[PDB]
Design a binder for this molecule. Structure first.
Ligand SMILES: [K+]
Ligand SMILES: [K+]
Ligand SMILES: [K+]
Ligand SMILES: [K+]
Length: 262
């Protein structure tokens, strides 16, 4: 095993949990993986798949993103920072997409799932862009249960890194759509203590975090260093105790180990 993998294994051992990392260097298309083929609960990182599915729809329904959407009291779930600001009012699918991606709003995610026809509509878009691994089974908030061994609402680090590459740097989306997604990921408010904290401060980053039971702490990022091809980095982490605390530091340290392995 590589030098990087030795250091990621040691980080994992010090943490008491289970760590998953996938890097894709778009220079030589080489990959670094740690438990790259194990399943991890996605938690809110699945918001990227749902927002991207809606973007794919907007390519033919050219006014879809401005479509208003009723926010009703019964739509509110466990974590609704933006949507609770509009109960008995409306929000557009663009506003819901940005609330989901940039504030991790769970009512926003549920509206995107509805627009897609249920969780199966998210999974279907994954299958349509070549991702045979991702699976979304539940809505918010039950998709966060993160039960050990449960395959519901999981993916693997390798699959999510490949997919995130296609949506953000590839052409799985149309060009207007891809840049909307990139802008959204760059304006995330929830990621300062996760991957971003382990990286050179000059690098540009867009990311989506996730957190859930079993101290599940996740981040998926696309990374633009200065002077070299961009990278995609996925870091998943989950823990043995159902009530375990968040460990965003593990993700920052994973990113540091990866960046220093370049
Ligand atoms: K093992
Ligand atoms: K969330
Ligand atoms: K699980
Ligand atoms: K938690």
């Amino acid at each position: 095993t590589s030098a990087v993998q030795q250091k990621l294994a040691a980080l994992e051992k010090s943490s008491g949990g289970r760590l998953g990392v996938a890097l894709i260097d778009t220079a030589d298309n080489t990959q670094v993986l740690y438990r790259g083929d194990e399943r991890f609960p996605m938690c809110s990182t699945s918001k990227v798949m749902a927002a991207a599915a809606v973007l794919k729809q907007s390519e033919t329904q050219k006014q879809l993103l401005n479509q208003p959407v009723e926010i009703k009291p019964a739509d509110l779930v466990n974590y609704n920072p933006i949507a609770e600001k509009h109960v008995n009012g409306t929000m557009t699918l663009a506003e819901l997409s940005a609330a989901a991606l940039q504030y991790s709003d769970n009512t926003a995610m549920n509206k995107l799932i509805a627009q897609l026809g249920g969780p199966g509509g998210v999974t279907a878009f994954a299958r349509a862009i070549g991702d045979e691994t991702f699976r979304l089974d539940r809505t918010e908030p039950t998709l966060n249960t993160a039960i050990p061994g449960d395959p519901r609402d999981t993916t693997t680090p390798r699959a999510m890194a490949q997919t995130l590459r296609q949506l953000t740097l590839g052409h799985a989306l149309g060009e207007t759509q891809r840049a909307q997604l990139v802008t959204w990921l760059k304006g995330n408010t929830t990621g300062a203590a996760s991957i971003r904290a382990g990286l050179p401060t000059s690098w540009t980053v867009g990311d989506k975090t996730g957190s859930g039971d079993y101290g599940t702490t996740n981040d998926i990022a696309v990374i633009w260093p200065q002077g070299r091809a961009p990278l995609v980095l996925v870091t998943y982490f989950t823990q043995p105790q159902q009530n375990a605390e968040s460990r965003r530091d593990v993700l920052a340290s994973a990113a540091r180990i990866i960046a220093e392995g370049l």
